[PDB]
Design a protein around this nucleic acid. Structure first.
Ligand SMILES: [Mg+2]
Ligand SMILES: [Mg+2]
Ligand SMILES: [Mg+2]
Ligand SMILES: [Mg+2]
Ligand SMILES: [Mg+2]
Ligand SMILES: [Mg+2]
Lengths: 88, 159, 78, 183
RNA sequence: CGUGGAGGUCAGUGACGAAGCCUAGACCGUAAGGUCGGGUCGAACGGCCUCUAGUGCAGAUCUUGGUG
RNA sequence: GUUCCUGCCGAAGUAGAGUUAAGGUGCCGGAAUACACGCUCAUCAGA
RNA sequence: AAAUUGUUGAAAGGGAAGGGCAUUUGAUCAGACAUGGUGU
């Protein structure tokens, strides 16, 4: 294995196509999600890059902003969240 | 009564309704071959009416043409050939006429096999068939020539 | 729904994506009014100009170094 | 957490199970439903009967499919995709008969419906509305239960073997030294 | 913003194609719209300053022709 | 009957970020199928 | 002259023609730094 990231699901838009809601595995609380803020998101061949902005709700869903908005057909699509830029 | 209503809608004002009725009648014949004679009789009952109207008889002749015949249905074929000739004499006695004659010739060509009619019946119309061969619509002349060839072969005329 | 809040910024208003304000031109004399304002303005030949005049306007515009918004119009299609 | 999740239909409510499954499908998870004939609905038998009628597909699986499609925006591209992700079956057809099947606690009738409140079994409703296959499925289910009893005996033997193996690993040193040191 | 009327003006535009109409094309304006390209059109007309007229729809009684 | 588009004054606006009222947190739909009490399932249950 | 009707020809389709959505496979078009200077 060579995985240095966690593959997460893209849920939906903020309801605003600019903001996207990302569900990340093993994150039940906003406190757990606070770690992932600022990390780079990559939807994968072509790749679109973005970043995690802030938490969303009590379930651990987070907000995300990409350089170009997702096409809205990727709700439930697999998305990667890397560890850099690390704050630890 | 259901068949009466359905075949009555052949003479509907709207061409779409007439086409739908013709399609459904042909489907009904295929589903139940045994009612083919009854359906043909019902269609004949409208096409030969004094107030038939060109639309109704035209679609009825189309429906009769698109019927299927088997080598044991001589009575049905003998019905159809006589019906076509009666209609042909009815309307002969132009562009609208050309299409109806095209369809009637198609029907007579379709039913001339399977039809055990004396050759003398066709001989009455033979000259008339030649009158079609020089007609304005060549599509009628093709079928007229087909009928002429079939009658000449079976009757063994000089040709 | 249209309303004033949608109004565009003045510095960017009336600007093509090339960055040149479009100015209608009828003849060579009107072209020459845009001699130095090549950065700010680009010429646009009028619809009613004949083909013989358009080539002259294009030649003079190239000499002056003024961008034409619609060249190859009525000399080529689309 | 798995590529595919097999959910048993027994003892579940159509609305809650359908909502949960629809939510999972919209997130991309693939789910297949089996043994939907024995699904449950709250209320009395007549009321569900007339509800399915004033709708009037007779099979229980199709009723569940309608209930789930009511959640998803099927007319959109996304809703259609969620719908092909789904699978529904009456009884367990192959190959899922050889795979263990999870339970959704949120839709369980035992945990949700209060004792002494009338409910309705979807199989009886489907048979009453004109689904003439409840009989064949029952015999297949009985055969499946016999096979499952055999599998349970095999699993008990496997658990005994696992206990013996765990005992064997206990008298090895390296694990004991590792646990004391860390982890 | 758009529609005509008149005066003045652009040494305006025009068979190397004027006016009119269309244009799920490009640019501009928040918008009414404007400019260009193309199509259509086939002989003249437009821009601009002034004064003067002057912006698109709804529905009813029904009427007429025509078709059942 | 209505009265091209935009703006303005007045009885009795556009975009980004954050906060918040009214509301809401089963899914469509963004939010706890969270907690804690008292109740009620009625042939008029109750939205 | 419109509006309307009929014959003939071409094409698509199915009992209606018909659309929207998804996937599939393809075909075809546009896609600068003409980067200012120095060095062997
Ligand atoms: Mg033009
Ligand atoms: Mg004037
Ligand atoms: Mg126009
Ligand atoms: Mg714009
Ligand atoms: Mg604001
Ligand atoms: Mg063909």
């Amino acid at each position: 294995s060579h995985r240095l990231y966690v593959k997460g699901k893209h849920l939906s838009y903020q309801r605003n196509p600019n903001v996207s809601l990302i569900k990340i595995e093993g994150v039940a609380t906003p406190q757990d999600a606070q770690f992932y803020l600022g990390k780079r998101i990559a939807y994968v061949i072509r790749v679109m890059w973005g970043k995690v902005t802030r938490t969303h709700g009590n379930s651990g869903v987070v907000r995300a902003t990409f350089r170009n908005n997702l096409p809205a057909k990727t709700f439930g699509a697999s998305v990667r969240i890397f560890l850099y830029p690390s704050n630890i | 009564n259901l068949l009466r209503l359905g075949v009555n809608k052949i003479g509907d004002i709207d061409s779409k309704v007439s086409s739908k009725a013709s399609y459904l009648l042909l489907k009904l014949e295929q589903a139940h071959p045994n009612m083919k004679s009854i359906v043909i009789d019902a269609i004949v009952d409208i096409a030969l009416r004094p107030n038939a109207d060109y639309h109704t008889t035209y679609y009825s002749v189309i429906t009769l043409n698109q019927t299927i015949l088997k080598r044991s249905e001589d009575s049905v074929a003998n019905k159809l050939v006589k019906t076509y000739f009666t209609l042909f004499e009815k309307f002969l006695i132009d562009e609208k006429n050309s299409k109806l004659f095209s369809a009637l010739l198609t029907g007579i060509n379709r039913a001339f096999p399977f039809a055990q009619i004396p050759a003398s019946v066709y001989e009455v119309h033979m000259e008339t068939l030649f009158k079609i061969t020089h007609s304005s619509n060549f599509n009628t002349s093709i079928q007229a020539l087909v009928l002429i060839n079939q009658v000449t072969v079976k009757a063994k005329l000089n040709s | 729904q249209p309303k004033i809040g949608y109004g565009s910024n003045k510095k960017t208003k009336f600007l093509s994506p090339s960055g040149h304000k479009t100015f209608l031109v009828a003849n060579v004399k009107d072209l020459e009014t845009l001699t130095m304002h090549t950065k700010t303005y680009a010429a646009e030949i009028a619809h009613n100009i004949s083909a013989k005049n358009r080539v002259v306007i294009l030649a003079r515009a190239k000499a002056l170094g003024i961008k034409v918004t619609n060249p190859k119009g009525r000399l080529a299609l689309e | 957490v798995e590529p595919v999740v097999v959910i048993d239909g027994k003892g579940h409510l159509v609305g809650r199970l359908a909502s949960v499954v629809a939510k999972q499908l919209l997130n991309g998870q693939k789910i297949v439903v089996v043994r939907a004939e024995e699904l449950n609905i709250s209320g009395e038998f007549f009321r569900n009967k007339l509800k399915y009628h004033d709708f009037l597909f007779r099979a229980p699986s199709r009723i569940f499919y309608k209930a789930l499609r009511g959640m998803v925006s099927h007319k959109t591209a996304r809703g259609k995709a969620a719908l092909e992700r789904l699978k529904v079956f009456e009884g367990i057809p192959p190959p899922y008969d050889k795979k263990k099947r999870v339970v959704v606690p949120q839709a369980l009738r035992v945990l949700r419906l209060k004792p002494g409140r009338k409910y309705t079994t979807l199989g009886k409703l489907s048979t009453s509305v004109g689904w003439k296959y409840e009989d064949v499925v029952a015999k297949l289910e009985a055969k499946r239960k016999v096979s499952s009893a055999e599998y349970y005996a095999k699993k008990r033997a496997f658990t005994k073997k696992v206990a013996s193996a765990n005992a064997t690993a206990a008298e090895s040193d390296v694990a004991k030294q590792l646990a004391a040191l860390g982890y």
